[PDB]
């Protein structure tokens, strides 16, 4: 379950399909009028993602949007390649747009000094908090969830099976991690951002959460359960509350260690 590892794709619920690697989530939200891809994994992982979308029966050329959670190599490293293979437009939080274009995270990132650059993407555009991304019958809402990066977005939609619908959340990372030289206690905008994001995420309507690092919401344990119990295994309307609580815990542990 390395970041670039192959992973057989699978449907989580309705038109929501996992197409990521063994280590990094990516989701295809499908329709007859074309598809939305959330995240690209790594540069090497783009070849996995692309094969996975085809394995689920879909054409790359029908992927119209690529939505970015945030602009680090593990989630975004494959976006450029995917953008070239699909022709899609890439959508991201305002403050991450320049990072996706260049593949270089800025000094405001707590991990600056320890991040690896990744390929820059074409066709990157900003979305605002609350904004809807529409494609045919698809409707995906952007929620600003800054802190791990300034432009982090958590994306939400509804998927249905014969009219039984669930609220699905692709949860951006909420983790306070840094370079050795970085003190969170000196950076109030990042701390405030993280706290506001924990609050936003724990309030989301959230039947199925797919975390950017899938194991954050126990994806693989859930998939193993689904073999027997079906896709109810992915459903847990407390999962966004749990991702938020873990984020909060990680930040409070860190602030205490900095005293
Ligand atoms: C530092 C991490 C990782 C990246 C990394 O491993 O370098 C970094 C670029 O940000 N990505 C991260 C993120 O939260 O998006 C964070 S924490 C994440 C949650 N549990 C994962 C883990 O512990 N693994 C060994 C896979 C990593
Ligand atoms: Na694969
Ligand atoms: Na489908
Ligand atoms: Na994993
Ligand atoms: Na590109
Ligand atoms: Na974003
Ligand atoms: Na950024
Ligand atoms: Na661009
Ligand atoms: Na961080
Ligand atoms: Na259930
Ligand atoms: Na978390
Ligand atoms: Zn990251
Ligand atoms: Zn990550």
Q: Three-state SS for 11?
A: strand
Resolution (A): 1.4
Q: Where are the beta strands (DSSP E) in the chain?
A: 10-13, 16-18, 27-29, 35-38, 63-67, 89-93, 124-127, 132-135, 138-144, 153-161, 164-171, 208-211
Q: Which of 84, 17, 73, 87 is nearest to 45 (CA)?
A: 73
Domains of the chain by residue range? 1-259
256 vs 259: CA distance, rounded Å: 5
Q: Experimental method used, please? A: X-ray
Written out in words, the top-level CATH class of the domain with range 1-259 is alpha beta
Structure tokens at 125: 């555009």
| Edge-to-edge strands, sheet with 132-135 | 132-135, 138-144, 153-161, 164-171, 208-211
Q: Hey, whose CA ends up nearest to atom 5 of ligand 1?
A: 74
Ligand nearest to the CA of 111: 9
What are the residues whose beta carbons fall under 8 Å from the beta carbon of 218, sequence distance 6 or more?
none
CB 36 within 8 A of CB 138: yes
Distance (angstroms) between ligand 6 centre and the Cα of 216 equals: 19
Q: Hey, whose CA ends up nearest to atom 1 of ligand 1?
A: 177
Binding residue numbers: 70, 72, 74-75, 148, 213
Q: Is the CB of 86 under 6 A from ligand 1?
A: no
């Amino acid at each position: 379950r390395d970041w670039s590892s192959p992973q057989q794709p699978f449907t989580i619920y309705g038109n929501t399909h996992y197409v990521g690697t063994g280590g990094i989530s990516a989701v295809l939200l499908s329709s007859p009028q074309g598809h939305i891809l959330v995240d690209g994994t790594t540069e090497k992982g783009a070849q996995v993602v692309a094969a996975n979308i085809r394995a689920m029966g879909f054409k790359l050329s029908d992927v119209k949007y690529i939505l970015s959670t945030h602009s680090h190599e593990d989630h975004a490293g494959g976006i450029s390649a995917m953008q070239k293979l699909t022709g899609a437009t890439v959508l991201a939080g305002a403050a991450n747009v320049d990072t996706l274009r260049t593949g270089v995270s800025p000094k405001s990132d707590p991990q600056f000094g320890s991040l690896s650059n990744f390929p820059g993407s074409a066709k990157v555009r900003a979305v605002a908090d609350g904004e809807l991304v529409k494609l045919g019958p698809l409707a995906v809402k952007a929620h600003a969830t800054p802190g791990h990066t300034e432009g982090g977005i958590t994306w939400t939609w509804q998927s249905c099976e014969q009219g039984k619908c669930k609220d699905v959340v692709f949860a951006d990372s909420l983790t306070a991690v840094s370079a050795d030289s970085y003190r969170f206690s000196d950076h109030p905008e990042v701390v405030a951002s993280l706290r506001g994001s924990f609050e936003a995420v724990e309030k989301l309507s959230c039947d199925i959460a797919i975390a950017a690092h899938p194991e954050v919401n126990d994806m693989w344990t859930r998939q193993q359960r689904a073999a027997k119990e079906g896709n109810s295994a992915y459903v847990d309307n407390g999962a966004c509350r749990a991702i938020a609580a873990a984020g909060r815990k990680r930040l409070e542990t860190r602030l205490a260690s900095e005293k």
